[PDB]
Design a protein around this nucleic acid. Structure first.
Lengths: 197, 200
DNA sequence: GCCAATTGGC
DNA sequence: GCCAATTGGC
């Protein structure tokens, strides 16, 4: 099964003048390929209820009338890309945020909600992602964060995120204003697709 | 490393408790550190200069906003909620305080839907981990260089407590749940028993 | 200049 | 059930 992408279908989406977002872009480029996109995938929805808490903690917290054995508490990624042959999955997030850009003061980029995406660096979620998605190669992280909005052109935010990721520079992508869906797909195609093999 | 050489001032903390004064992380640690080699910093400045000189490829520079300032002397960084330094060894533990509501008695489950506490996870990025270990001096692999103290109803929320427990995996001592009504002693005991030795 | 942490959205 | 990501605050 070739891993070639459907650039013709993507060009049609672009030509249809339709506003491109991550979903219609990957949906178009994956048509007839061995890849499929999921919006709000459910693979990681059953992680927390089964967590074993010391009896000392149980006594100190609120214990609702609930059957934890059948309770599914977990996370809901913005999206996931699956190679339907190997069934390996890359889970992703989309962080949209304003930023300090031309004509604005630094305060326009003072927001910090994007830090929330760093929950993916916790050892527990890294372990869960690797187990469920199948990407065990230590060379890359098992998630992909796509940033959107003026934060992607903010001199401070861009350097901050670059600093955070350190040697995992391909695990995030800055999808800048007015940029084509093609560049978003090229990042996946050139830097991440091989890890689903 | 004798126990006496690092004994905390438990009597000063008991005095604070006996005074009836409202306890918070700062007055609790300031009291317990009285006369010792440890000092607590509120908003430490050790990590004030981190990002401005980060190198960006020419093809990225071309696509971003480049302000007309001198990045070589610009200080962009972070400001931890607190830090604990052993002034004899100069090793430092950096900390955060995350207060948040939660699903507890008398509340609808929606009271625990909040997720801003996730921001604290920035400390797990490889970049900040390296910066924290370099500055604070803690390279022991079995412990992380930071300590996140949670406060508020989130500390008793059945889903949030399990979520955070899960996140931390085998680094359970790198966070502490300071519950409503809990005194300062429990907070200090966590540091004393699980983290203080990493400042030796 | 940097962090708080919430209420509304899907 | 779980995520969006902002504006207020010092």
């Amino acid at each position: 099964l070739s891993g070639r992408l459907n650039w013709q279908a993507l060009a049609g989406l672009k030509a249809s003048g339709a506003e491109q977002n991550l979903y219609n872009v990957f949906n178009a480029v994956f048509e007839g390929t061995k890849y499929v996109l999921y919006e709000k995938p459910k693979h990681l929805k059953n992680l927390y209820a089964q967590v074993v808490l010391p009896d000392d903690v149980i006594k100190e917290i609120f214990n609702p009338l609930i059957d934890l054995s059948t309770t599914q508490w977990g996370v809901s990624p913005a999206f996931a890309i699956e190679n339907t042959e190997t069934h390996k999955i890359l889970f992703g997030e989309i962080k949209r945020q304003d930023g300090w850009v031309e004509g604005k003061d630094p305060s326009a980029g003072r927001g910090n909600a994007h830090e929330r995406s760093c929950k993916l660096f916790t050892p527990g979620l890294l372990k869960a992602y690797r187990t469920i998605g199948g990407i065990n190669d230590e060379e890359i992280l098992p998630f992909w964060v796509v940033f959107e909005g003026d934060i992607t052109r903010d001199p401070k935010r861009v350097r901050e995120i670059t600093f955070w990721y350190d040697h995992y520079q391909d695990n995030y992508f800055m999808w800048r204003p007015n940029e084509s869906g093609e560049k978003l797909v090229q990042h996946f195609n050139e830097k991440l697709k091989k890890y689903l093999d």
